Amino acid sequence: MFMREIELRGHIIDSLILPKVFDKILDMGGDYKVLEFEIGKRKTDPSYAKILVIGRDERHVDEILNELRDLGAEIPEIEEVELQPA
Amino acid sequence: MFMREIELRGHIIDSLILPKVFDKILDMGGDYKVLEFEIGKRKTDPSYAKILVIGRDERHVDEILNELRDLGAEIPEIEEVELQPAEKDMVLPEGFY
């Protein structure tokens, strides 16, 4: 099984970024674990979430990744950060 | 300086609940610090947040907690509760900036 960790930075709180991300991951046969979650220090700053995505194999997982990038685009004010060797 | 710990439970994310809790505490002259945050296994499960509430004294913090208690009673997706500390004395004196 292959897994990669991604991070969502930005307006995580009142958006559907996370549910949408979670639905996508599961929709394609993957699973996730939220490894870190830090809320925006004041009700002003960017929260972030480190999500661990888990798959059968690297091509599988990456196919999910790429779709997760596409979601990042549409939903406004959320940045995706790569943690590992891209 | 007094502190009590509270916990929100339910649909923390995709709510405005958090910014509302924070706003209310700040409006009333307290400060808060988010201590823990746990997400459920599927978005249909409940998450929870532990938040420490800090005011000038117990009387006043109790005022805040009661406002926060009424907030949770209004919003249906979430319940609010207080946590008893494993420590008796929850007061801090002035200093520590």
- Give the residue extent of every domain in chain A: 2-86
CATH superfamily, domain at A2-86: LOR/SDH bifunctional enzyme, conserved domain (3.30.70.2690)
Kindly report the number of other CB atoms within 10 A of residue B4's CB atom.
19
Neighbours of B9 (CB within 10 A): 16
Resolution (angstroms) equals 2.7
Sign of torsion over alpha carbons A37, B9, B13, B54: negative
To probe the interface with A, which of B26, B33, B39 has the most A CB atoms within 10 Å?
B39
Q: Mutate one of B11, B25, B43 to test the A interface: name it (highest A CB count within 10 A).
A: B43
**CATH architecture for the domain at B2-97:** 2-Layer Sandwich (3.30)
State the structure-solving technique: X-ray
Say how far residue B64 (Cα) sits from the centre of its chain.
Answer: 9
- Give the helix ranges, DSSP H, for chain A: 17-27, 58-74
Q: Buried b / exposed e across A8-38, counting CB within 10 Å, b at 16+?
A: bbbbbbebebbebbbebbeeeebebebeebe
Token pair listed for B92: 């801090």
Confirm or reject contact between A59 and chain B (CB < 8 A). no
